[PDB]
Amino acid sequence: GRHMIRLGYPCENLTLGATTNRTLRLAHLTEERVREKAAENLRDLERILRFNADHGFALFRIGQHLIPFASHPLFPYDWEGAYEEELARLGALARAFGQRLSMHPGQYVNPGSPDPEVVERSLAELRYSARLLSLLGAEDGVLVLHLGGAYGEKGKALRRFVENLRGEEEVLRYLALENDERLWNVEEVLKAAEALGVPVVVDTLHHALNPGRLPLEEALRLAFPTWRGRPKVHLASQDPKKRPGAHAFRVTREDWERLLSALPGPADVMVEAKGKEQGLA
Ligand SMILES: [Mn+2]
Ligand SMILES: [Mn+2]
Numbered sequence: 001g002r003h004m005i006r007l008g009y010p011c012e013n014l015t016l017g018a019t020t021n022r023t024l025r026l027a028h029l030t031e032e033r034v035r036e037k038a039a040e041n042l043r044d045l046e047r048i049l050r051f052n053a054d055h056g057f058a059l060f061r062i063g064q065h066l067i068p069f070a071s072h073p074l075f076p077y078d079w080e081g082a083y084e085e086e087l088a089r090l091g092a093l094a095r096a097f098g099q100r101l102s103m104h105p106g107q108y109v110n111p112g113s114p115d116p117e118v119v120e121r122s123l124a125e126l127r128y129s130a131r132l133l134s135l136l137g138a139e140d141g142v143l144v145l146h147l148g149g150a151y152g153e154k155g156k157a158l159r160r161f162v163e164n165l166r167g168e169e170e171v172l173r174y175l176a177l178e179n180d181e182r183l184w185n186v187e188e189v190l191k192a193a194e195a196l197g198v199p200v201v202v203d204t205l206h207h208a209l210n211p212g213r214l215p216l217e218e219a220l221r222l223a224f225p226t227w228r229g230r231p232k233v234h235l236a237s238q239d240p241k242k243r244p245g246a247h248a249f250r251v252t253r254e255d256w257e258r259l260l261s262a263l264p265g266p267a268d269v270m271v272e273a274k275g276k277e278q279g280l281a
């Protein structure tokens, strides 16, 4: 059924054994082997889009390794010329299905690092991610990022984060910032996001562990105005008795309920659960 709240899951589908996330060792980074992996990941991207259209999922997060090692100085070919046509085609499918596409670079992507080498590698990775979403024609695509490390002093870490991203026209087309469970709350992310002119993704588990002064309801209410399009939110549940913020297999009914009650209006909810497409109902 057609709900005002659209759902998604990241990277892979467990029912199908489909993934967008195959990689390889850099010792095996041959033109032929990468083309191998990329092809299977693109095949799987397509199956997933089709499975989502038949099973009520409007959102999908494409894993970083879709084109394995694309941002790496040893990448064996022009991936954009190789794939532009097929990405446009997959992009048109996703739009025909009404699907919204996203990527979330890992915890080692840190534009606010003071190490210039980490900055350059991080920027390379975000530029590849943004180019991919551009080639898929993802008009409302999202590229989600945590604010990363305090590196001893937050004011300076944030100023580096903004300086190192303000110039990046293409990345800024898609970039949205997300609160975390340890270092940067929603009030903090809203400040960073305004400086950069980008939206805020509220994560409900992270919010719970690290709320600042804000009830979830006010967090969502402040975040909603930061999206020109449909706001995106993350939904996870605590994996019982494990490390705080560890993701449960399936989201609880109680946690789903609490978000539904807090949302100020229509939004897109990425379910971050170890079960993937089995993470809710
Ligand atoms: Mn996140
Ligand atoms: Mn999250």
Ligand SMILES: [Mn+2]
Binding pocket: 205, 206, 236, 245, 247, 272
């Ligand atoms: Mn999390």
Ligand code: NA
Binding pocket: 254, 257, 258, 261
């Ligand atoms: Na409730």
